[PDB]
Design an enzyme around this catalytic site. Structure first.
Site, PDB file in Angstrom:
ATOM      1  CG  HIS A  84      -0.323  -0.038   2.399  1.00 32.52           C
ATOM      2  ND1 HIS A  84      -0.214  -0.799   3.463  1.00 32.52           N
ATOM      3  CD2 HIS A  84      -0.273   1.267   3.279  1.00 32.52           C
ATOM      4  CE1 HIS A  84       0.199  -0.122   4.486  1.00 32.52           C
ATOM      5  NE2 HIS A  84       0.002   0.743   4.358  1.00 32.52           N
ATOM      6  CG  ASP A 120       0.342  -3.474   3.053  1.00 28.11           C
ATOM      7  OD1 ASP A 120       0.624  -3.354   2.104  1.00 28.11           O
ATOM      8  OD2 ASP A 120      -0.308  -3.214   4.177  1.00 28.11           O
ATOM      9  N   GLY A 146       2.687   6.862   8.804  1.00 27.39           N
ATOM     10  CA  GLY A 146       3.912   7.282   8.352  1.00 27.39           C
ATOM     11  C   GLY A 146       5.106   6.211   8.996  1.00 27.39           C
ATOM     12  CB  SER A 168       2.481   2.075   6.217  1.00 30.00           C
ATOM     13  OG  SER A 168       2.208   2.467   7.479  1.00 30.00           O
ATOM     14  N   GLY A 169       4.522  -0.128   6.201  1.00 31.07           N
ATOM     15  CA  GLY A 169       5.599  -1.010   5.250  1.00 31.07           C
ATOM     16  C   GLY A 169       7.156  -0.632   6.595  1.00 31.07           C
TER      17      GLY A 169
END
Ligand SMILES: [Ca+2]
Length: 223
Positions: free
Chosen positions: A40, A84, A175, A177-178
């Site tokens: 995402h 994801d 922020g 994320s990942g």
């Protein structure tokens, strides 16, 4: 990172910042030429920033490398966030050292109760908005699947796991994320989603990296 602490400059050498004129997602360096992040987080024109601490000031040790290609898992579903995970190939090989180093992929899925280190430059507030200059860290345990599925009825798939605190107050946020979830020197999770940030009975949901080891290795080998 909400309810966390300042990691300290370059104490998380595998942590990367995905930049497009501003920090938008975290990532993990798995080798000299590849980063693993959340699907995402995808977007064209990504510059991977390695060796970062204060992401607003150039203070030394940073390495800015353009992404030559971003590989989103073909089964990624934007509505459920299942699968994801995204592989990012760097245009040129990163320079590995004391401040910049890769993190190892897991050989087995971690069990509940295991303590992990979550990190990022994401929001530090539960209600408001406050983005940090320096990398923030958080120690959190992997929750049992029963508690996880109880918190998010019918939203948890075999490719996800919960980690965090049910009392609230500590969690990853926008922020982050990942970003990496490292337990016992291994990358077990990727900051994916959740309902709000640091809210009670709403722990963070992460991508179960141990279910993608084969895919990651096979994709990298053919690219
Ligand atoms: Ca910097």
């Amino acid at each position: 990172i909400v309810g966390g602490y300042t990691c300290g400059a370059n104490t998380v050498p595998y942590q990367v910042s995905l930049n497009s004129g501003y920090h938008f997602c975290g990532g993990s360096l798995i080798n000299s030429q590849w980063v693993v992040s959340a699907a995402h987080c995808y977007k064209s024109g990504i510059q991977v920033r390695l060796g970062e601490d204060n992401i607003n000031v150039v203070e030394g040790n940073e390495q800015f490398i353009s992404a030559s290609k971003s590989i989103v898992h073909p089964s990624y579903n934007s509505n459920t966030l299942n699968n994801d995970i995204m592989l990012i190939k760097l245009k040129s090989a990163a320079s590995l050292n004391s401040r910049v180093a890769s993190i190892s992929l897991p050989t087995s899925c971690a069990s509940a109760g295991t303590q992990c280190l979550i990190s990022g430059w994401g929001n530090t507030k539960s209600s408001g908005t406050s983005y940090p200059d320096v990398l923030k860290c958080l120690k959190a345990p992997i929750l049992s699947d029963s508690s996880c599925k109880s918190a998010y009825p019918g939203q948890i798939t075999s490719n996800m796991f919960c980690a965090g605190y049910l009392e609230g107050g500590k969690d990853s946020c926008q922020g982050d994320s990942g970003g990496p979830v490292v337990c016992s020197g291994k990358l077990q999770g990727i900051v994916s989603w959740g309902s709000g940030c640091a809210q009670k009975n709403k722990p963070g949901v992460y991508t179960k990296v141990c279910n993608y080891v084969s895919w990651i290795k096979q994709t990298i080998a053919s690219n």
